C-alpha cells in the first residue's frame, strides 16, 4: 500500500539543479521514515546510470527511483518545476527531454513497479491534465492526483 500525502507534493523554485530536485523530493520521505537516511544518494547514482525522463507530449516527466532494498515503506513524491529542467530520456536518447513534472517512486517490491509505470502512463497521457498541473496549487494537484490513482486502482481490479 503506497502512501500519498499532501506533504509529498510540492512546488520547486526556479534555477534548481536535478541533484537538488532529488534531495528535496527525498527529504520528506526520509523525515517520515519511508526510506533510508541516504536514500537520495542511491537515487541520484541510479539516476546517472539509468535516465528516468519521459517526453510525453504536453510536459516532460521524470521517474527517479532506486533498488527496492533501500526503500522501507512504499511512497511517491511529486515535484512541479516552474521552468523546464533538463532530464535525459529514458531508454537512451541523445536529445534531452524538458521535464516539468517529477515523479519519485519508492517501491519495496519489484513486481509492483510495472503496475505503477502503467498508472503513470495513464495520468500523463491526458494532455489537458498535464498542462493543468502547472496552474493548480499544491493542494489542487494533490487532490487531482489522489482522485486519479484511486480511480485507476478500481479500474485495475
Amino acid at each position: 500500500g503506497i502512501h500519498f500525502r499532501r506533504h509529498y507534493v510540492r512546488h520547486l523554485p526556479k534555477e534548481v539543479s536535478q541533484n537538488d530536485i532529488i534531495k528535496a523530493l527525498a527529504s520528506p520521505l526520509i523525515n517520515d521514515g519511508m526510506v533510508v537516511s541516504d536514500f537520495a544518494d542511491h537515487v541520484i547514482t541510479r539516476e546517472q546510470n539509468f535516465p528516468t525522463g519521459l517526453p510525453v507530449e504536453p510536459v516532460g516527466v521524470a521517474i527517479p527511483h532506486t533498488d527496492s532494498k533501500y526503500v522501507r515503506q512504499n511512497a511517491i513524491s511529486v515535484g512541479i518545476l516552474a521552468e523546464p529542467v533538463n532530464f535525459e530520456d529514458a531508454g537512451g536518447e541523445p536529445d534531452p527531454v524538458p521535464v516539468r513534472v517529477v515523479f519519485m517512486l519508492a517501491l519495496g517490491n519489484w513486481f509492483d513497479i510495472t503496475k505503477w509505470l502503467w498508472y503513470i502512463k495513464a495520468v500523463i497521457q491526458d494532455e489537458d491534465f498535464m498542462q493543468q498541473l502547472l496552474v493548480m496549487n499544491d493542494d489542487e494537484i494533490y487532490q487531482s492526483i489522489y482522485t486519479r490513482i484511486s480511480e485507476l486502482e478500481v479500474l485495475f481490479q
Epitope: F50, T52, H65, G91, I113, T114, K115, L155
Partner: antibody
C-alpha cells in the same frame, strides 16, 4: 500477435560464457517485465529472475545472483541473458517470458507470453 | 523465501471428470500474487490464471482458480484430451518469484 523469438540451440564447454537473446516481434515490452525461466532435464520450472526494460532494473533469484546477468535493449526490442563460468548443472532449456497484460494493457504480474525456449548443453 | 508445494504429484483422471490441484505456500502470498501454468511436452508453458482467481485471455470456462493466504486451488470442472498436461503454480508476491514442483494429470484407463 505479440511473440517472443529466442536464439538457436547452443552446446558449450565447461567454463565458457553463454549469451541468449529474446526479441519481441509483436510490441514494445519496455513497459512490461521480461523474465527468464529455466528447466533442467527431468525437473520443473525455475524462476531465474527478470529485467524491467525501460527502467533497466533487474531482479535476480538468490540462486542465480552471482553468475547470471540480465539486460534489454528498447530500440530493437530484444532482451539478453548472460551466464559466465558455465557448469554441467547449467544444462537446461531456457525460456523468456513477457509479463501478461489485462484489459487496457494492465500488467497482471504473471508471465503471459513465452518464447519457444533455447536448449543449452554443457559438456566436454 | 516462499516455498510452494503442490499435491498430488500425479492425478489420474478420465475425460469428463473434475480435477482439483492444490498449491500451498509456507508464508502468506502477498496480494494473492499467484499464477497457474500449463506445460505440455514440446510446447512453451501456457499461462492459465493470474492472481488468485483471474483468468488469462483465451482460457476456456473449465479452468478456475480459488484460494488466498497460504492455500490455493486450481479446478477443472470438465476434462478433455487437451487438458492432460503438467501444471505449475508460481507466486510473485515475494521479493523473488518461485515455482511449485508441479502436478501431472494423465489419462486413466
Amino acid at each position: 500477435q505479440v511473440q517472443l523469438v529466442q536464439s538457436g540451440p547452443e552446446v558449450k564447454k565447461p567454463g565458457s560464457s553463454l549469451k541468449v537473446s529474446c526479441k519481441a516481434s509483436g510490441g514494445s515490452f519496455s513497459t512490461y517485465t521480461l523474465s527468464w525461466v529455466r528447466q533442467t532435464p527431468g525437473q520443473g520450472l525455475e524462476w531465474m529472475g527478470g529485467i524491467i526494460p525501460l527502467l533497466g532494473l533487474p531482479n535476480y533469484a538468490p540462486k542465480f545472483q552471482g553468475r547470471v546477468t540480465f539486460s534489454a535493449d528498447t530500440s530493437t526490442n530484444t532482451a539478453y541473458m548472460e551466464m559466465s563460468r558455465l557448469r554441467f548443472e547449467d544444462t537446461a532449456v531456457y525460456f523468456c517470458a513477457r509479463e501478461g497484460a489485462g484489459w487496457f494493457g494492465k500488467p497482471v504480474g504473471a508471465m503471459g507470453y513465452w518464447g519457444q525456449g533455447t536448449t543449452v548443453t554443457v559438456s566436454s | 523465501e516462499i516455498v510452494l508445494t503442490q499435491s498430488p504429484d500425479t492425478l489420474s483422471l478420465s475425460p469428463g471428470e473434475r480435477a482439483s490441484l492444490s498449491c500451498r505456500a509456507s508464508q502468506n502470498v502477498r496480494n494473492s500474487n499467484l499464477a497457474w501454468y500449463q506445460h505440455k511436452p514440446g510446447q512453451p508453458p501456457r499461462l492459465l490464471i493470474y492472481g488468485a482467481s483471474s483468468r488469462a485471455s483465451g482460457i476456456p470456462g473449465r479452468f478456475s482458480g480459488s484460494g488466498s493466504g497460504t492455500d490455493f486451488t486450481l479446478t477443472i470442472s470438465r476434462l478433455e484430451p487437451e487438458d492432460f498436461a503438467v501444471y505449475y503454480c508460481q507466486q510473485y508476491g515475494g521479493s523473488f518469484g518461485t515455482f511449485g514442483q508441479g502436478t501431472k494429470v494423465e489419462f486413466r484407463r
